[PDB]
């Protein structure tokens, strides 16, 4: 059997294959309340019918002002539990496992009113300057990630992923380019990592299941973070009990990034090798052959697929055919697959 | 531009492209009450996100004993209206038009208790002998199609299609192989067609929107119906106001059928030409090139896609690429399509 | 099995499949003597390795002033026999049958010195006015087609095709738009056809093997030839012993042509049905599904492939895969096909 | 521009792209004289028309008894120069560069009469036991590689590759599993490498152009050679002036090899990184995406394609389309590509 379609167990969770639907914002919560809509349901459940091993729900704000846009999904209120409970149940019924990405847009939040970050530094020339979070505010935000995780557990999610990438709040604390704080949350790598450290420990108090952390393995910028920095954070996350690091990159500030098939794979491979940590590979992986190569050559443990799953919801089937293998089809499509 | 992606107007309905999702039973009404389930919602709505011009909902029984299986959808009760109302609303929200196939399995019903047909002739050796419908029972069934159409209109459907194919009730009345009646519903081509004639006229009393009729253009059997017979029926349907004939074939009785890409297209083109009736082509059509060829060579007006839409929900996108053309993507997928 | 990959016998010739490499000028006779070059050898033989059932060599001029360009292949000299003999031998060694298209560009010849045609009417504004052939010149040309056919037979070709399409010499005689003669070669459909009639009869005197004739089934021009005219010609060719009509279209004069997948298939099916003549379909056919549909629906007997064989020399293999079937691979590629 | 289609200069040779047709035996020298045939010409030249940057001709024996089979190509005689001269000229004319793989089958030679190897050990239970080469015979074989290289230069080849892989002669000397010699050519890694060392130095005396060496980076067998051993040989080859190491693997003896897309890439990456030597990656690479990933992530310098070039001679075009880029088409196919 192909490794891509070989099961894997993480904590109490067993995925039927190594294909993961990468979290992707749909900006479709038109009521601006962070709640799910019929579109979200059809969008996610169709990939479950499509046999994706694990579906990670798009960035979901742990605080309303932590949304990227007012059309984002949210999990800052118990009122968000009802909808998510229906989603997890329906995705699970099709045979897929489901996760949610807990997030906070930080200085990249496109909302009216003050937005927050570790330091009052704008993302770019077009962005509003954020307010530096008070130590009190930082600690309250840590509690919001914990509270959000508790809601995700109640909602029935199998995995929880902390969004510590793409220039958002946590990433902003991690990088010296965006974190100029003079308190316990800034300075040394230990201090810059403190925010994430506290989030992981608190989430641990309410969630014992699989815990992923998505990082931007590089800032591709002089004086910014690079893979060496992230290998360091990874070892600390391993000690804290993080099960897998979802390896993305960039977006802290505009930068020149050479994009190509598997351009972020080196990050997943190095963290896996040097930090002895399971990793998720993502970034222009669009066919089963590359997915299989990545896994067989020990470059990552899970293959995150984003845009290809937008073009082909049934990528699992397509990948199976490309690898000349067979996978179970959803019962209702037996006469077509 | 490509004809396949050029709008077409039928009555007061305008389709953005000429791709139609052929009706396909999902056997997922697990409560056996003919109601829709979350699976049906994700199943159909995902193809609307996928830009299918017109989605025809699977065979929905106009009478509980007219279901193929107890897992079929139904529209024999006002209780079915609420669910269908949500479905049409959500499918239309994506930009697709939606239709429903009104059906009655006749002697091919796989249910407990008496099953009905024009004559007491079983489908095959493994099938129960059906009860010959009394003239009044035939009339009650006509009213049930009428009542079902009224519910469909209320639920918000854009198109209504009468299932007069695949060996089910109406087809059974149409063919001399299954209809041996000597009353007003049998004996001559006109009388064998009477049941359908009354159904069309009655549906017209409560529905003046697009009206489709799916037929099995041939029984592929000696003494059975052939394309010449259906060209005759098409002429009569034209006079009655039918807008398009969905051209399928077979299934009245077991027969040896040579299946291949476009094996039913000749039926669609002959009826279109000889009956001056718009037609829908269906059967082993799996790529944009053939779809465009059928439309451009005037063989049909709409291209019905079945199994390829089970393998690839976003066939519209794939076909556009194959035809070296571009179509609008759902807003949420602009970064991937 | 698939019809596309089922053998077919024409006269004493049996093709292993029904895929034909449509004649395509390579403009590679750099010494301007009409002789073959190493490029031509690799070009044609690679498609034989590729399992194409029948390979038709590009337009080969029966007279030097009948070439389209001075870079064309020729067969107006016994000096051309040696090269063609090597080509047929090597192509047949792979299992493919081979044919040659005998041609004469007429008024579309892009050469220095007088060019000829049935009437002194130029192709367009950027073309030289041709010399009206004297009756004797017409007769000499008929003999040149005969002599060319004799050379083709000697060189080992399996099939001979007369190029009576694309606005070249024979086509020019056939259409009233380009033929205004009032002698035995003009004035009525019979007289306009006379040139072709004499060519067929004379070729028959030295060649009794498969004989094809490529025509432009329509001029797409008011007062020009249309499919009705060609069905008439096909009936006459049938009487003369022509085995198959290769159905192309246009090019006599500039015209607006709606091109799409299978845009010339209607010509092939109408002639096949109304003239009871075997036909070759060509024009935007790029995949196995359409090829099979054309054959199974009785629209043509052979599928001519042009540009797709330039993009994919091994189209036979690709088509087999698309049709979920398998064909024998050349022995040398058994480990790859 | 994509790296796969970015030129690279090695010595005095510039390749227009990084795609290389991996050497592949055709067993088509039916006259058993090691000479080329029309099949070989069409086979190789078609990939040149297909735009492959570099075409490596199949294993060509430096001694008749060094052939794998009596149908192999040879270069053990000046009589082989004439044919090769025509091949290199024609491949170069299409715009591709060409190389030849100098080889000696050793104990895997399937010929009548004594076969040779470093030690009298059979390849497997089905094979004949080879005769241990005398020291004199070994040195004569070194001279045969030199003499063959001289013929390749005269024939017009751009690159010469030494076949030191797949269980053949040189590989047999390199591995302790097959080399039990007690003289200067056996024992220590220095002694086991001596045969290849002498071949490289002698070839250098007659050839100053690009020099490749293909190795089996692992024997996948206990007590056999592994990547660590080959990294060692690579450093020595670097010192000797070898320009690139073509990284294959296995075939010294039967072994359990886990085959998958890019399964030999780790070898190319490690040798490149640790030996500071340019490398060629090969082994189930069938699409442009993986080819691009390998190059962009610095895993190899050239992408060798084998079986995919047997299925798709115009893989370069296919890969270009997969990478959404454009490459020049052969002039004759401008209207198809
Ligand atoms: C429309 C869209 C929405 C996205 N939303 C998210 C998100 O909420 N969280 C996240 O971590 N990444 C997000 N991403 C990044 C993707 O998950 C993925 O890592 C990226 O596209 C690289 O992979 P791909 O080449 O497979 O698409 C998004 C990308 C797109 C195109
Ligand atoms: C699982 C399944 C369910 C189907 N259900 C229906 C149905 O409810 N009504 C109908 O008219 N045809 C039904 N069909 C026939 C299809 O609509 C379609 O006409 C047929 O599959 C031929 O087209 P295709 O080759 O595009 O699939 C079904 C076919 C399949 C495979
Ligand atoms: C480069 C090129 C050369 C051609 N040469 C010839 C020729 O010599 N004789 C002929 O009858 N048609 C010729 N044609 C027309 C083709 O044979 C074929 O009928 C046409 O391209 C339509 O088919 P296709 O879509 O499969 O390419 C040529 C077309 C191209 C693009
Ligand atoms: C029919 C055939 C012939 C081959 N001949 C040779 C050869 O002469 N020399 C060599 O080094 N490898 C030879 N190989 C191995 C290939 O060059 C290539 O390295 C191998 O197939 C792995 O790559 P692929 O997956 O791209 O085919 C051959 C393979 C096949 C299938
Ligand atoms: O909407 C795009 C998006 C990209 C990356 C993220 O992390 C979040 C949103
Ligand atoms: O489930 C298959 C099916 C086929 C044709 C129909 O019409 C109804 C159901
Ligand atoms: O080169 C294009 C060409 C087209 C049609 C012909 O018949 C001859 C040449
Ligand atoms: O013919 C297959 C073959 C494989 C590997 C080699 O090295 C030589 C020949």
Coordinates of N, CA and C in Angstrom, one line a residue, chain C residues 173-291:
Chain C
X173 N -11.0 22.9 -59.6 CA -11.8 22.4 -60.7 C -13.2 22.1 -60.3
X174 N -13.3 21.5 -59.1 CA -14.6 21.1 -58.6 C -15.6 22.2 -58.2
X175 N -15.1 23.3 -57.7 CA -16.0 24.4 -57.4 C -16.2 25.5 -58.4
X176 N -17.5 25.9 -58.6 CA -17.9 26.9 -59.6 C -17.3 28.3 -59.2
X177 N -16.8 28.4 -58.0 CA -16.3 29.7 -57.5 C -14.9 29.9 -58.1
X178 N -14.2 28.8 -58.4 CA -12.9 28.9 -59.0 C -12.8 28.3 -60.5
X179 N -13.8 27.6 -60.9 CA -13.8 27.0 -62.2 C -14.9 27.7 -63.1
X180 N -14.4 28.5 -64.0 CA -15.3 29.2 -65.0 C -15.1 28.7 -66.4
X181 N -14.5 27.6 -66.6 CA -14.2 27.0 -67.9 C -15.5 26.6 -68.6
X182 N -15.5 26.7 -69.9 CA -16.6 26.4 -70.7 C -16.3 25.2 -71.7
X183 N -15.2 24.5 -71.4 CA -14.9 23.3 -72.2 C -15.3 22.1 -71.4
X184 N -14.8 20.9 -71.8 CA -15.2 19.7 -71.2 C -14.9 19.6 -69.7
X185 N -14.1 20.5 -69.1 CA -13.8 20.5 -67.7 C -14.5 21.5 -66.9
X186 N -15.6 22.1 -67.4 CA -16.3 23.1 -66.7 C -17.8 23.2 -67.2
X187 N -18.6 24.0 -66.5 CA -20.0 24.2 -67.0 C -21.1 23.4 -66.3
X188 N -20.8 22.2 -65.8 CA -21.8 21.4 -65.1 C -21.1 20.7 -64.0
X189 N -21.9 20.1 -63.1 CA -21.2 19.3 -62.0 C -20.4 18.2 -62.5
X190 N -20.9 17.5 -63.6 CA -20.2 16.4 -64.2 C -18.9 16.9 -64.8
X191 N -18.9 18.0 -65.5 CA -17.7 18.5 -66.1 C -16.7 19.0 -65.1
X192 N -17.2 19.6 -64.0 CA -16.3 20.2 -63.0 C -15.6 19.0 -62.3
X193 N -16.3 17.8 -62.3 CA -15.8 16.6 -61.6 C -14.9 15.8 -62.6
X194 N -15.0 16.1 -63.9 CA -14.3 15.3 -64.9 C -12.8 15.2 -64.6
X195 N -12.1 16.2 -64.2 CA -10.7 16.2 -63.9 C -10.4 15.1 -62.9
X196 N -11.2 15.1 -61.8 CA -11.0 14.1 -60.7 C -11.4 12.7 -61.3
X197 N -12.4 12.6 -62.1 CA -12.9 11.4 -62.7 C -11.7 10.7 -63.5
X198 N -11.1 11.5 -64.3 CA -10.0 11.0 -65.1 C -8.8 10.6 -64.3
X199 N -8.5 11.4 -63.2 CA -7.4 11.1 -62.3 C -7.7 9.7 -61.7
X200 N -8.9 9.5 -61.2 CA -9.2 8.2 -60.5 C -9.1 7.1 -61.5
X201 N -9.7 7.2 -62.7 CA -9.6 6.2 -63.7 C -8.2 5.8 -64.1
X202 N -7.3 6.9 -64.3 CA -6.0 6.7 -64.7 C -5.1 6.0 -63.6
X203 N -5.3 6.5 -62.4 CA -4.6 5.9 -61.2 C -5.0 4.4 -61.1
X204 N -6.2 4.1 -61.4 CA -6.7 2.7 -61.3 C -6.0 1.8 -62.3
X205 N -5.5 2.4 -63.4 CA -4.8 1.6 -64.4 C -3.4 1.1 -63.9
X206 N -2.9 1.8 -62.9 CA -1.5 1.4 -62.4 C -1.6 1.0 -60.9
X207 N -2.7 1.2 -60.3 CA -2.8 0.9 -58.8 C -4.2 0.3 -58.5
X208 N -4.3 -0.9 -58.0 CA -5.6 -1.5 -57.6 C -5.7 -1.6 -56.1
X209 N -4.8 -1.1 -55.4 CA -4.8 -1.1 -53.9 C -5.8 -0.1 -53.3
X210 N -5.8 0.0 -52.0 CA -6.7 1.0 -51.4 C -6.5 2.4 -52.0
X211 N -7.7 3.1 -52.3 CA -7.6 4.4 -52.9 C -8.5 5.3 -52.1
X212 N -7.9 6.4 -51.5 CA -8.6 7.4 -50.7 C -8.6 8.7 -51.5
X213 N -9.6 9.5 -51.2 CA -9.7 10.8 -51.8 C -10.1 11.8 -50.7
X214 N -9.3 12.8 -50.5 CA -9.6 13.8 -49.5 C -10.3 15.0 -50.1
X215 N -11.4 15.4 -49.6 CA -12.1 16.5 -50.2 C -12.4 17.6 -49.1
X216 N -12.7 18.8 -49.6 CA -13.1 19.9 -48.7 C -14.6 19.8 -48.9
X217 N -15.3 19.2 -47.9 CA -16.8 19.0 -48.0 C -17.6 20.3 -48.1
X218 N -17.0 21.4 -47.9 CA -17.8 22.7 -48.1 C -16.8 23.8 -48.3
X219 N -17.3 24.8 -49.1 CA -16.5 26.0 -49.3 C -17.0 27.1 -48.4
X220 N -18.0 26.8 -47.6 CA -18.5 27.8 -46.6 C -18.8 29.2 -47.3
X221 N -19.1 29.1 -48.6 CA -19.3 30.3 -49.3 C -20.5 30.3 -50.2
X222 N -21.3 31.4 -50.3 CA -22.5 31.5 -51.1 C -22.1 31.2 -52.5
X223 N -22.8 30.4 -53.2 CA -22.6 30.0 -54.6 C -21.4 29.0 -54.7
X224 N -20.8 28.6 -53.6 CA -19.8 27.6 -53.6 C -20.3 26.2 -53.3
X225 N -19.4 25.3 -53.2 CA -19.9 23.9 -53.0 C -20.3 23.7 -51.5
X226 N -21.2 22.8 -51.3 CA -21.7 22.5 -49.9 C -21.8 21.0 -49.8
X227 N -22.1 20.5 -48.6 CA -22.2 19.0 -48.4 C -23.1 18.3 -49.4
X228 N -24.2 18.9 -49.9 CA -25.0 18.3 -50.9 C -24.3 17.9 -52.1
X229 N -23.4 18.9 -52.6 CA -22.6 18.7 -53.8 C -21.6 17.6 -53.6
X230 N -21.0 17.5 -52.4 CA -20.0 16.4 -52.2 C -20.6 15.0 -52.0
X231 N -21.9 15.0 -51.6 CA -22.6 13.7 -51.4 C -22.7 13.2 -52.9
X232 N -23.0 14.1 -53.8 CA -23.2 13.8 -55.2 C -21.9 13.2 -55.7
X233 N -20.8 13.9 -55.4 CA -19.4 13.5 -55.9 C -19.1 12.2 -55.3
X234 N -19.4 12.0 -54.1 CA -19.1 10.7 -53.4 C -19.8 9.5 -54.1
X235 N -21.0 9.7 -54.6 CA -21.7 8.7 -55.2 C -21.0 8.3 -56.5
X236 N -20.5 9.3 -57.2 CA -19.7 9.0 -58.4 C -18.4 8.3 -58.1
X237 N -17.7 8.8 -57.0 CA -16.5 8.1 -56.7 C -16.7 6.7 -56.2
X238 N -17.8 6.4 -55.7 CA -18.2 5.1 -55.2 C -18.2 4.2 -56.5
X239 N -18.9 4.7 -57.5 CA -19.0 3.9 -58.8 C -17.7 3.7 -59.4
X240 N -16.7 4.6 -59.2 CA -15.4 4.5 -59.8 C -14.4 3.6 -59.0
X241 N -14.9 3.2 -57.8 CA -14.0 2.3 -57.0 C -13.2 2.9 -55.9
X242 N -13.5 4.2 -55.6 CA -12.8 4.8 -54.5 C -13.2 4.1 -53.2
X243 N -12.3 3.8 -52.3 CA -12.6 3.0 -51.1 C -13.0 3.9 -49.9
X244 N -12.5 5.1 -49.8 CA -12.8 5.9 -48.7 C -12.6 7.4 -49.0
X245 N -13.5 8.2 -48.4 CA -13.4 9.7 -48.6 C -13.0 10.3 -47.3
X246 N -11.9 11.0 -47.3 CA -11.2 11.6 -46.2 C -11.9 13.0 -46.2
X247 N -12.8 13.3 -45.2 CA -13.6 14.5 -45.1 C -13.1 15.7 -44.4
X248 N -12.4 16.6 -45.1 CA -12.0 17.9 -44.6 C -12.9 19.0 -45.1
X249 N -12.5 20.2 -45.1 CA -13.3 21.3 -45.6 C -12.6 22.6 -45.8
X250 N -13.2 23.6 -46.5 CA -12.6 24.9 -46.7 C -11.3 25.1 -47.4
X251 N -10.8 26.3 -47.4 CA -9.5 26.7 -48.0 C -9.5 27.0 -49.5
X252 N -10.7 27.0 -50.1 CA -10.7 27.4 -51.5 C -10.5 28.9 -51.6
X253 N -11.2 29.6 -50.7 CA -11.1 31.0 -50.6 C -11.3 31.4 -49.2
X254 N -10.9 32.5 -48.7 CA -11.0 32.9 -47.3 C -12.5 32.9 -47.0
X255 N -12.8 32.3 -45.8 CA -14.2 32.3 -45.3 C -14.2 32.2 -43.8
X256 N -15.3 32.6 -43.2 CA -15.5 32.5 -41.8 C -15.9 31.1 -41.4
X257 N -15.1 30.4 -40.7 CA -15.4 29.0 -40.3 C -15.4 28.8 -38.8
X258 N -16.6 28.3 -38.4 CA -16.7 28.0 -36.9 C -16.0 26.7 -36.6
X259 N -14.9 26.8 -36.0 CA -14.1 25.6 -35.7 C -14.3 25.2 -34.2
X260 N -14.5 23.9 -34.0 CA -14.7 23.3 -32.7 C -14.4 21.8 -32.8
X261 N -14.3 21.1 -31.6 CA -14.1 19.7 -31.6 C -15.1 18.9 -32.5
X262 N -14.6 18.2 -33.5 CA -15.5 17.5 -34.4 C -16.3 18.3 -35.4
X263 N -15.8 19.5 -35.7 CA -16.6 20.4 -36.6 C -16.7 19.9 -38.0
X264 N -16.0 18.8 -38.4 CA -16.1 18.3 -39.8 C -16.7 16.9 -39.8
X265 N -17.1 16.4 -38.6 CA -17.6 15.1 -38.5 C -19.0 14.9 -39.3
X266 N -19.8 16.0 -39.3 CA -21.1 15.9 -40.0 C -20.9 15.5 -41.5
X267 N -19.8 16.1 -42.1 CA -19.5 15.8 -43.5 C -19.3 14.3 -43.7
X268 N -18.5 13.7 -42.8 CA -18.1 12.3 -42.9 C -19.4 11.4 -42.7
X269 N -20.2 11.8 -41.8 CA -21.4 10.9 -41.5 C -22.5 11.0 -42.6
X270 N -22.7 12.2 -43.2 CA -23.7 12.4 -44.2 C -23.2 11.6 -45.5
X271 N -22.0 11.7 -45.9 CA -21.5 11.1 -47.1 C -21.5 9.6 -46.8
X272 N -21.2 9.1 -45.6 CA -21.2 7.7 -45.3 C -22.6 7.1 -45.5
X273 N -23.5 7.8 -44.9 CA -24.9 7.4 -45.0 C -25.6 7.5 -46.3
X274 N -25.5 8.7 -46.9 CA -26.1 9.0 -48.2 C -25.4 8.5 -49.4
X275 N -24.1 8.3 -49.4 CA -23.4 7.8 -50.5 C -22.9 6.3 -50.3
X276 N -23.2 5.8 -49.1 CA -22.8 4.4 -48.8 C -21.3 4.3 -49.1
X277 N -20.6 5.3 -48.7 CA -19.1 5.3 -48.8 C -18.4 5.4 -47.5
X278 N -17.4 4.6 -47.3 CA -16.6 4.6 -46.1 C -16.0 6.0 -46.0
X279 N -15.9 6.5 -44.8 CA -15.3 7.9 -44.6 C -14.3 8.0 -43.5
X280 N -13.4 9.0 -43.6 CA -12.4 9.3 -42.6 C -12.9 10.6 -42.0
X281 N -12.9 10.7 -40.6 CA -13.3 11.9 -39.9 C -12.0 12.6 -39.5
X282 N -12.0 13.9 -39.6 CA -10.8 14.7 -39.1 C -11.2 16.1 -38.7
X283 N -10.5 16.7 -37.8 CA -10.8 18.0 -37.4 C -11.0 18.2 -35.9
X284 N -10.0 18.6 -35.1 CA -10.1 18.9 -33.7 C -10.5 17.6 -32.9
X285 N -10.1 16.5 -33.4 CA -10.3 15.2 -32.6 C -9.0 15.0 -31.8
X286 N -9.1 15.1 -30.5 CA -7.9 15.0 -29.7 C -7.9 14.0 -28.6
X287 N -9.0 13.2 -28.4 CA -9.0 12.2 -27.4 C -9.7 10.9 -27.8
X288 N -9.4 9.8 -27.1 CA -10.0 8.5 -27.4 C -11.5 8.4 -27.3
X289 N -12.1 9.2 -26.4 CA -13.5 9.1 -26.2 C -14.3 9.6 -27.5
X290 N -13.9 10.7 -28.0 CA -14.5 11.2 -29.2 C -14.3 10.3 -30.4
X291 N -13.0 9.8 -30.5 CA -12.7 8.9 -31.6 C -13.6 7.6 -31.5

